[PDB]
Amino acid sequence: SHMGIFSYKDLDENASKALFSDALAISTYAYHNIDNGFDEGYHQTGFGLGLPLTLITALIGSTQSQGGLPGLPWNPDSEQAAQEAVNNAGWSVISATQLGYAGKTDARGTYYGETAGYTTAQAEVLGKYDSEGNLTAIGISFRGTSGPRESLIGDTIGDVINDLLAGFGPKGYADGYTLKAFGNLLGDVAKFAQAHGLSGEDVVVSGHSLGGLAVNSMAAQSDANWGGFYAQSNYVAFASPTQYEAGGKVINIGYENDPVFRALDGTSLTLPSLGVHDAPHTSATNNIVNFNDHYASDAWNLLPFSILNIPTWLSHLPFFYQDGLMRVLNSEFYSLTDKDSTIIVSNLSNVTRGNTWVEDLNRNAETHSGPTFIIGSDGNDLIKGGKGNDYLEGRDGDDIFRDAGGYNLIAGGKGHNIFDTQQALKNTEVAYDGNTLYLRDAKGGITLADDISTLRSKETSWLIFNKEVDHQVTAAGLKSDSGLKAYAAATGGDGDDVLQARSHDAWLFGNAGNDTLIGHAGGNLTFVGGSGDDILKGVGNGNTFLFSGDFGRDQLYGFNASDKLVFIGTEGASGNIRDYATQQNDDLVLAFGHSQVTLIGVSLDHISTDQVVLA
Residue 581 and residue 602: Cα distance in Å, rounded? 11
Q: What is the CA radius of gyration of the chain?
A: 27
Using the minimum distance from each CB to Ca ion, give the nearer residue, 233 or 417: 417
Minimum distance, C-beta of residue 465 to Ca ion, in the bound complex (Å): 26
470-489 exposure pattern, b = at least 16 Cβ within 10 A, e = fewer = ebebeeebbebeeeeeebeb
Is residue 198 within 8 Å of 241, Cβ to Cβ? no
Q: Is 394 annotated as a binding residue?
A: yes
Using the minimum distance from each CB to Ca ion, give the nearer residue, 256 or 258: 256
The single residue of 209, 217, 240, 595 carrying the catalytic annotation is: 209
Beta bridge partners of 342: 372
Q: Is 396 annotated as a binding residue?
A: yes
CA 127 to centroid of chain Cα atoms: 27
Using DSSP's 3-state secondary structure scheme, residue 464 falls into: coil
Find the angle CA(14)-CA(17)-CA(18) to the nearest 5 degrees: 90
Is residue 252 within 8 Å of 220, Cβ to Cβ? no
Residue 490 and residue 517: Cα distance in Å, rounded? 10
AA identity, residue 121: A
* Nearest of 610, 608, 574 to residue 592 by alpha carbon: 574
Q: Is 540 annotated as a binding residue?
A: no
Is residue 451 within 8 Å of 417, Cβ to Cβ? yes
Minimum distance, C-beta of residue 145 to Ca ion, in the bound complex (Å): 7
Minimum distance, C-beta of residue 383 to Ca ion, in the bound complex (Å): 8
Would you give the end-to-end CA distance of the chain in angstroms?
14
- The H or E element that residue 82 is part of is helix 78-88
Minimum distance, C-beta of residue 590 to Ca ion, in the bound complex (Å): 13
Using the minimum distance from each CB to Ca ion, give the nearer residue, 45 or 372: 372
Residue 9 and residue 11: Cα distance in Å, rounded? 6
Q: Is 211 annotated as a binding residue?
A: no
Q: Which residues bind Ca ion (CB under 5 A)?
A: 120, 122, 147, 155, 159, 256, 278, 286-287, 365, 376, 381, 385, 390, 394-395, 397, 399, 403, 406, 408, 412-413, 415, 417, 492, 497, 510-511, 513, 515, 529-530, 532, 534, 551-552, 554
Q: Is 377 annotated as a binding residue?
A: yes
Helices (H), 285-387: 293-296, 318-329
* Nearest of 510, 516, 545 to residue 530 by alpha carbon: 510
Residue 463 and residue 460: Cα distance in Å, rounded? 8
Strands 477-480 and 467-474 come out as antiparallel
Which value, to the nearest 10 degrees, does the dihedral of the CA atoms of residues 249, 343, 395, 400 take? 180
Using the minimum distance from each CB to Ca ion, give the nearer residue, 212 or 385: 385
Distances (CA, A) of 555 to 127, 517, 525, 568, 598: 52, 11, 17, 18, 5
Q: Is 457 annotated as a binding residue?
A: no
Q: Is 270 annotated as a binding residue?
A: no
Q: Is 363 annotated as a binding residue?
A: no
Residue 614 and residue 569: Cα distance in Å, rounded? 8
Minimum distance, C-beta of residue 210 to Ca ion, in the bound complex (Å): 8
Using the minimum distance from each CB to Ca ion, give the nearer residue, 258 or 293: 258
Q: Is 146 annotated as a binding residue?
A: yes
Q: Is 470 annotated as a binding residue?
A: no
Using the minimum distance from each CB to Ca ion, give the nearer residue, 406 or 538: 406
Using the minimum distance from each CB to Ca ion, give the nearer residue, 13 or 587: 587
Using the minimum distance from each CB to Ca ion, give the nearer residue, 234 or 377: 377
199: annotated active-site residue = no
Minimum distance, C-beta of residue 162 to Ca ion, in the bound complex (Å): 8
DSSP 503: T
Strands 446-450 and 477-480 come out as unpaired
Query: Which residues belong to the annotated binding site for Ca(2+)?
Result: 120, 146, 155, 159, 256, 278, 286-287, 377, 379, 381, 386, 388, 390, 394-397, 399, 403, 405, 408, 412, 414, 417, 493, 495, 497, 510-513, 515, 529-532, 534, 551, 554
Residues at the binding site are 120, 146, 155, 159, 256, 278, 286-287, 377, 379, 381, 386, 388, 390, 394-397, 399, 403, 405, 408, 412, 414, 417, 493, 495, 497, 510-513, 515, 529-532, 534, 551, 554
Q: Kindly list the catalytic residues.
A: 209
